[PDB]
Design a binder for this molecule. Sequence first.
Ligand SMILES: CNc1nc2cc3c(=O)[nH]c(N)nc3cc2[nH]1
Ligand SMILES: CNc1nc2cc3c(=O)[nH]c(N)nc3cc2[nH]1
Ligand SMILES: [Zn+2]
Ligand SMILES: [Zn+2]
Lengths: 370, 370
Amino acid sequence: RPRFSFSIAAREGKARTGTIEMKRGVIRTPAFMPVGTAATVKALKPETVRATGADIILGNTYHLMLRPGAERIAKLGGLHSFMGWDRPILTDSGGYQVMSLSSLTKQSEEGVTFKSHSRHMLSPERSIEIQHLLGSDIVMAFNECTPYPATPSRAASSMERSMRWAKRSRDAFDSRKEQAENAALFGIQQGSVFENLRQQSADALAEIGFDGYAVGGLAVGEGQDEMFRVLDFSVPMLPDDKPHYLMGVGKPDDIVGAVERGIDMFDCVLPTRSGRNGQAFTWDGPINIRNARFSEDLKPLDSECHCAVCQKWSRAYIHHLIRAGEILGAMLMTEHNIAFYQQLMQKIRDSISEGRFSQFAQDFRARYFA
Amino acid sequence: RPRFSFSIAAREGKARTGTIEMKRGVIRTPAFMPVGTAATVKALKPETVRATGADIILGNTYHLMLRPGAERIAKLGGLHSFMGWDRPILTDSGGYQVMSLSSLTKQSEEGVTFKSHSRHMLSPERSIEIQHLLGSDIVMAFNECTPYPATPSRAASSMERSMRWAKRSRDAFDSRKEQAENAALFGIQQGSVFENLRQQSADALAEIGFDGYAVGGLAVGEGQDEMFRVLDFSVPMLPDDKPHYLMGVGKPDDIVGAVERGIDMFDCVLPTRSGRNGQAFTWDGPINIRNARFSEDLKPLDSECHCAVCQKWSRAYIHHLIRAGEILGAMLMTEHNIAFYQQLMQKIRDSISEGRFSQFAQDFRARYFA
Ligand SMILES: CNc1nc2cc3c(=O)[nH]c(N)nc3cc2[nH]1
Ligand SMILES: CNc1nc2cc3c(=O)[nH]c(N)nc3cc2[nH]1
Ligand SMILES: [Zn+2]
Ligand SMILES: [Zn+2]
């Protein structure tokens, strides 16, 4: 019913669990968002995505503006209607994908001009408009993702431009009455691995004011140790009373450690992509289902998993499908992996609410990395 | 409950509608069997195959004996358990696929030796044993599919060898108590396009005695006109009181015409394969969903179709998925096409039972080829 209402029900150290209420549904936090880059969570019907426990999925301004096009999607009744997902959708703003996917790129204070992997423009104003056209529930400010590594000086100028673009994103979003009334807007913290820059970035974002705050510029090659180090000081800089979104993260251990450091929201292509590639997540660590050791294994992918795939099909069958290149193989692997991620989020939420998250993290790691 | 019981409830001309009762379920006839060659109906969960209306699916001795192997499947508890389809499964005997898929082939009275697309042997005895190991409900006699075209002399010798192999198939099947008690055995009529050979073949099959009778050696390049001509005289040669299975057919019009000529059972990869390739069946004829005319079409694939895909998704969305190479595109297209085939079978069954099948065929053709 409300536009955006974040409520924290319980805490343990820096970890929080709670809910975000939005018009299209409730999002339980910490939350994992399956990635639906081309207006589909790959190899899954929306009803199946929902069955795994997902409360919200991620879309991409960059991909959708090229194909099938933002105005086209609006004309077809918006992204929710187009793809048949009626619950919240967060859309990334294009800033990251334009830098890692576009064949050619030209950056200025105005924004980015780029070549389609066809010439196109992105700016805070255009990014916000595209997300309006898509009908996103959570809109990301348009920004620049600083390349890693970066000098303090390069990170500084990059972060400052992002903060200028964040103000313009805010203004463009607020200018659109229907967007301001029905959607929410998140700012993106930058500043690379440098504490003083992260602080200035957080101060700039808080001064503008956002519904939520993402930690950007991580999961860009820095490694877990470095990422955790940056999170240690960066997350406490963000407003405590708003959701904290870590963009593009990540592996189960990354998620657990990030929650221990105050992160409430996550997205990664890992469960879907590695699913298609034969990697299945289990509580005993990942396994590669193509491996010959599984050819006659009648056990489910994981012994505890409650997902429909593990209720019905054996490792041996899925091993066969994946090795035969069968589509059903990708479907079952993906459903299980997304279900595994959601069960991980559930156990995280339950353990925080019950004040035993520290013990869960320890138990999880000891078994997962055995 | 019974092993195999075919009951004809209604007739119109040569057309029949009825049921086959088997231990694993009832098969409504005329029936269409989705093809599950690699132990999966491509891009569909078994529950979805069942949701479209399928009563029975087809498996292949040839593919399964290579991958994952027949003894392996038996060890894993049989094909039904392996793939999660608990209803009847008909398995082809290998005879056709060994000739059109094997890189090299050596034929004798014993059987066929061949190279895996690894060296392997097939014979009536080995074929029956493989199908036993798979746990097929309807077992096909091992035969030779005569190449088209063929001289009368070549068709004759080929047909005669098939009839000898049919006797051996019968004997091998009957020798296996558990198979004889729980499964059924179909013979395959051969004789190419020649009436006298079709007759001798039918006489040979009837003298041996089978639970059902397939018309083999068609859908091999002869064209609909020729196929219908052969069916005109061939089907009445088969026992009237047993099911009549036309192997590898086919397009909707082929199915309707074949039912008009006394066929009760069908299988084809057309709905699944062409589904993945962008072809969707509609009552107004097939359409190619990739075509630009569909990019903003909000209508479902077909306006009358009752399938879940047409209840929820637009042509525009599916057009997008298929053009983006997205797996969900293949999933939705395949579900709709199999659902369309099953709805066609239902309308055929209803119209025969109501004595208005002639009118249905006429109405169907006038609209489908408009
Ligand atoms: C997979 N790793 C990953 N790091 C990211 C950083 C950002 C970022 O700083 N900005 C925006 N807009 N998206 C992002 C997406 C990411 N995805
Ligand atoms: C797609 N066209 C097609 N014609 C067929 C004929 C036979 C046949 O004569 N014998 C056996 N064993 N399978 C068959 C499968 C076919 N599939
Ligand atoms: Zn599972
Ligand atoms: Zn349909």
